[PDB]
Each structure stands twice: as C-alpha cells, then as structure tokens.
Amino acid sequence: EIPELVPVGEMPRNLTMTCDRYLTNKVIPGTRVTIVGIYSIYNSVAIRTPYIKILGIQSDVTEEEEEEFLQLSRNPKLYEILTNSIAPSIFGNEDIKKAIVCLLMGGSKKILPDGMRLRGDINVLLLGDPGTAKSQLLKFVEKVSPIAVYTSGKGSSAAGLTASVQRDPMTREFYLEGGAMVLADGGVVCIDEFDKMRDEDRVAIHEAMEQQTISIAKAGITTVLNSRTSVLAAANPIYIDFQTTILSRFDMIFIVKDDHNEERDISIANHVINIHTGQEENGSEISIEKMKRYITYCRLKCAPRLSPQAAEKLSSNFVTIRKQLLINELESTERSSIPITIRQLEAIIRITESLAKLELSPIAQERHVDEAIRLFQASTMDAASQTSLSEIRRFEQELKRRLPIGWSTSYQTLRREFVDTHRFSQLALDKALYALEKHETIQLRHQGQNIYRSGV
C-alpha cells in the first residue's frame, strides 16, 4: 500500500498478484502501479488466502520530447542552469554543486580489447563539520537521479552494501543477495556517515568501487554480480582509520568550511527565513522530473570523448602541477608529501567527458579542460594541503625507553605525560601508537586505555 495511505502507528500490508502471457516483465520493484484485476481467493479453521488476478497494468513510468530536449541543450548557459537546479534550497557551496552535477552525469565508459577496461564513473567525498547540509545534498542527489539509493552507513552493515551470501529458506540452497551497490547498479549510491561504517564494510566498499563487480563466489555457489555505480560519500571530520589511502581512492575530496563573514551570515539567515516563509522555472531552473529525464537521455545517448589538443593541454597541465610542487618545495631537507598521483591524474580525466555529455558535445574542447582543472584544484589539492615524522621518531624512542619489558602504563597517563605537556601533539600520539602496536612491540589493553610492552 502507498506510504501516504498507511494510518499512523500501523504497518504496510502486502497482497500477492498474478499475471500471464503479455503482462509479464512489465514492472520492476519500486515502481508505482495501478492494477485492474479480479480479487479472488485460493486455498493454501476455514479461511482462505486472498490474492489478485491482474487484467491490466498502468505504471506511472517519442519525438516531441526529443525536440524539447534538443532545444534545451541549445541554451547558452546550460551548465549554469544545471548547477542551479542542484539543491536550489542550499546556499553557497558552488564547487560542491558543480562536482555533484558532474557525478550525476558521470564519465564515458572505456573498454580495451586486451581486457583492462578503465573506470568511467565518478565518486565524491564531502568531509566537513556538522551543520553544512551534506545530508540535504545527498538526499537531493538521491531524488534527482533516475536510479538512486540513499543508505546510512551505520544503519546498514556489510549485508546492506555490496553483497552477502545467504541461504534460500524454501529450498535450503546457498544463494547470493546483493546489497545497496547491487541494487544501485547503473545508478548512484549516496552513502551517509562514512565514519560510523565499520572498517570491514569500508574495505568491502573499497573493493566494490575498485572493480565495480562484487566478487562473492564461494560457499556452495560461484556466482558474481556487477556493481557499476557512483559513490557519493559524506563523512564527519576526522577530529588513522580515515587513512589517506581511501581518500586517494576518491576522485574528489571537499572540505566545506563556512567563513565567518557578516555578509555571508546575514545572507544565509535571509535565505533560510525565505525558505520558512515560502520558483523561477523560466530559464534559470528545471524541476526534478525534467532533470531526471535529461540525465537518462544524456547517459543513454551521448558518450563523448576528449580531443587531441585538449589531451596535450591536460598533459601540460599535469606537468605544470608537478612543476608547481617543484616550486613549492623551497625546503631543502623536508620532503613534499605528494604533488599528484597517477590515480589522481585519471581522476582529472572523465570529468571533462562529464561536461561534454552535459552539453551533448561530441568532442570535449579546452573549455571543459579548464573547468575540470579549476574544479579539481578547488577541491583536492587544497584539501590535501589543508618534521612531524622526526618528532614521531623521538616520541617512539621516549615511549620505548620509559616502559621496560612487561611493564604497563595507562594510555591516559602517557597522554598526560606527553600530550598535556605539549611536547607532542595528539595527532602524533595515535600515529606513533598505531605504528608501534602494528609491529607487536606494544599492546593496547582496556580499549586502548592501558599500554603494555610485548618485546624489543
């Protein structure tokens, strides 16, 4: 039954239905339908099980719409209107808006005859402090996309995402049931609260996005499923479990920080008050229905590819980025963390194709190149950038010297000795402790509240 008609405090009721011949394979789960049929009863004290015999299906789901869409694509500010339609109710965060648009459109698929087919989908990471409308952005992304799944990381588990091997009760045979990603194949999965999700589920997601084919083929069966999907991740601030490796897997990293400008604060206050007290749609925005059909059309029809001049320009851009770090490393002994990685290079590509597909442009021109360069620079380089190892060396030496073999001291006591004394920051405490524990020289006890040495 429809969610609206469910009385408060009650539960949705289900009804079995049957269709034959040319009425089969006409609907899929999650589609609103209108049914005309016979309400009959079949024997399974003197009760009978009701069911419906379908006679007609009319689900809410030509050339005229093609002409309308083509005329829309001819608008000279299509990119701006599309970026405006993304979360009309949330102020600021324009870069995140553009990144979400790119994610919605996605990147063109790549396949090679040898067997190494490159990824085309796009994933984004939103990592900012509370009260930033990340969840609202994720909700809007879920609603707008034709196929989308909104999942809370902590609410679900490894079974919820990727896939889990279960057993069929009726037949008692081990089978495979897909997770959120499987149900999101060909669409977008909006994962919220990336932090609270368990580490095992995080590595499962790592594999799923790495190969887009959840490989659970064992335990009585050897079946595999495809998980071609785009992941939008919103994570609470780190203040390592959130190691920079998983961040490197993400194409784009965003650190949202509202600046304390009186003008900005008054502007946001006015926007929210206008929301509470409250629609151009005349050349500056488009409703969810039109945008959804637009996304379907552009994803199914156009798969543009970059241009030779654009390719050379992007190669020169990466060269200039490496030279930019070369300029940055004015330090003589200190070493720069990373200018860029090759995975980040691949990330820079496949967003230009997203812009090309947005405008139905068969070949991406230099405009897309510069737009992508600016978008990446405004998100990842600064966030990555947003001595210490030598300090960790001294901290480790002091910890080893302080504790003999077999002697245990409280972790809080060590924090008081060093962190409170300010000789070493807290971020240098957990890192050194993890490095020491991973080598078995130290042991964590009482949920890490007591430190016990376990050898040289």
């Binding site: 057993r167 190691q243 156009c302 995975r343």
Partner: protein
C-alpha cells in the same frame, strides 16, 4: 553436448630456438626485460622476478631434512610505483598464481581452515591460497593489511613448507611447496630513508626473515620521467574500442582442436624497454631484442622441467668469499648464504647448463648486494 568457452607441448624446432637464445651471451637481460616491458626502471626487480619464477633446485637429504629451494620477494615502496602492475605481470607470466589480497581475503582464504555448515555441521577442510599453489607461485597483495591469524599461519607455512591440520577431529598433512611474492605499503604512507626497512614496515622479524630478498623502492620525481609516464597513461584513454563510431556508447569456432619468437618494437607498449637497453639514456635509440610473452612462458617451462644444475667448485670459491666479505665487512645472517646458492643455481638454469659456473655466482652476488645495500 557441452562446448567449453598451463603447458604448451614443445615441438622439435622450439627446442632448437630455445637453445639458440641460450647460446647468445646476453640472454639474461633479454628475458629480464621482456617481462613487464612497459614499466620504466626497476630493472633489478624484473631480473629477480624472473630468477624467482625459475626457482632453484630443492634438496632432500637422507635424514628427511628439506632445504628450501624456492625464492621469495617482498616489495615495499611509496604509492604508485607499479607494484600492482608487477603483480599482474608475474601473474600473467607465471604458470600458477593466486592474487589473494591480504586484506580480508573473501573467497579463498590465505591458508587452509576447516568449515562447518550452520545447521548440518558438515565438517570439511577448505584449502587456502598457500595450499592451492603447490610447486607454483602465490602473489599476495597488500601484505601490510594482514591480521594476526594470517601472520601466524603464514609464518608456519613458509618455515615448514607444509600445513598439518589437527582441528575438528581432522588430522592430515598438505604440502605447500611454493614461492611467495607480496607488496606492502609503509605504515605512515611514505617510505622514510632515515629508517630501516624493518621500521617502515611493521611486521616482526620472523615474517620478514622468511622473505629471501627484500626490495625497497621510492617514487622519485624527474621531469622527463613525468612526461613519459603522463604521455604513456594518456595514450590509452584516447585509444578506443575500434568498431563503432569512434568514442560513442561503448558495448570459439571449434572445441576439439621469425616474429613467433622475437617481438617487433612497439612504442605504445614497450616504451621504457628501449631505455633499458639504452642504459637510462632517453636519447638512445637502441631497439632491443625483446621476446613475446607466449614464448617466454615456454622458455621458463623448458628450463624448469629439464635442468637440474649442480654446484661447482669454481662458483663455490666466489660464493664463500662473497659471503665472508658481506658478513665480516660492510644484521647480515647465515641464511643469506642460502640465498647465494639458490640464486646461483637459478641463474645457471637460465644459461641452460647443468653446472653452476662463476658467472652465475658473481651475478647472483651482485643482485644480492643491490638488494641489501642501495
């Protein structure tokens, strides 16, 4: 009927071809750089990987003692140094391989472990990755993500070369003779030169000691190298599925059943292989005599199944002298002696000779010296 959708039977002239290549007194470089020709640099790693692939003679003493004769290699380095690419290439060129990553190896476990049904409780010994690579190779990935259970299992597996299960009323012994190649990123995300490799990795000396050779590789930034890598990676993206309007929505006949040996130069694929013969000189235009992978597999097959080199006095004087020089002069352990003999026999197998000669011992000693001191 059912229509389906290892080893290549050597012919009479294939043996002649392999002998012809063996006689050429440069074949070691050719074989080493034929594998993974795309990768720039890391030539010593390719040499060591081929040596591992061909292994060394295994000795079975009358006392039942079993002297290990299979080399092991561990890679540790900063991100983006083609570690996964090297693993893929050894997987493709190796007769047997299982890329069971060390991080929660869902599917096939790293080591054997009995299992029971939820309701019926049907006990059964499920073989892991190590057991499923007898007389072969296992290419572990992300060795730094292993859990204590896997570490304890692997220590015993490598030390003893066999697994004895004594759980759930099941008592059995399963051979695990194989070779292990693994990659492990540092603990802080970047390799620190000031620290020892045993510090940049966080495994106990017990695990690291089993690996015969340890290689430390760092990502260095050179302008010309950056341009080369960038262009090589870019080429593929513009490369297309030829068949339909270039860059658009992308989509056996029977069951019963000399460019063949050498490889024509390809700038797209080989690339750095030319730099290899140029000895790090980009300007050098020395087209190398690379060999196709299909024939290289035949070469390794023939060498591994027909040659049993025996140590010789001439190589043995230099083995003893080099080991003594290493130990007493610029912690080196007596087990490094085993490495010298193992690699000497492995290299002698490349030269298609039944006796280990001074050249094999000297080259193995040089490779070990590089693997120890930069």
């Amino acid at each position: 009927t059912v229509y389906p959708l290892a080893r290549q039977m050597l012919t009479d002239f294939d043996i002649r071809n392999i002998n012809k290549l063996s006689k050429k007194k440069d074949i070691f470089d050719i074989l080493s750089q034929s594998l993974a020709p795309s990768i720039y640099g890391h030539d010593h790693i390719k040499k060591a990987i081929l040596l591992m692939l061909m292994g060394g003679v295994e000795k079975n003493l009358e006392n039942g003692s079993h002297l290990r004769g299979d080399i092991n290699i561990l890679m540790v380095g900063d991100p983006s140094t083609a570690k996964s690419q090297l693993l893929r290439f050894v997987l493709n060129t190796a007769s047997l391989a299982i890329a069971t990553t060390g991080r929660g190896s869902s599917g096939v476990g790293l080591t054997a472990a009995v299992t029971t049904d939820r309701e019926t409780g049907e006990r059964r010994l499920e073989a892991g990755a190590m057991v499923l690579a007898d007389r072969g190779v296992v290419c572990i990935d992300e060795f730094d993500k292993m859990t204590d259970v896997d570490r304890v299992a692997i220590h015993e597996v490598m030390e003893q070369q066999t697994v004895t299960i004594a759980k759930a009323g099941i008592h059995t012994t399963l051979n695990a003779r194989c070779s292990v190649i693994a990659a492990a990123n540092p603990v802080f995300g970047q390799y620190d030169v000031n620290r020892d490799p045993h510090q940049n990795i966080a495994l106990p000396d017990s695990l690291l000691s089993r690996f015969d050779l340890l290689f430390v590789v760092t990502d260095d930034i050179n302008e010309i190298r950056d341009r080369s890598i960038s262009e090589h990676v870019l080429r593929t993206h513009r490369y297309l599925p030829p068949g339909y309007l270039e860059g658009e929505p992308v989509r056996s006949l029977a069951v019963g059943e000399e460019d063949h040996v050498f490889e024509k130069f390809n700038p797209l694929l080989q690339a750095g292989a030319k730099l290899a013969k140029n000895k790090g000189n980009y300007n050098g235009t020395e087209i190398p005599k690379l060999v196709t992978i299909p024939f290289l597999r035949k070469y390794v097959q023939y060498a591994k199944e027909r040659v049993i080199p025996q140590l010789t006095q001439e190589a043995i004087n230099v083995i003893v002298k080099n080991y003594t020089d290493l130990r007493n002069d610029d912690p080196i352990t007596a087990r490094t002696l085993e490495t010298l003999i193992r690699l000497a026999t492995a290299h002698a197998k490349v030269r298609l000779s039944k006796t280990v000669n001074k050249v094999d011992a000297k080259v193995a000693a040089n490779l070990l010296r590089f693997a120890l001191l930069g």
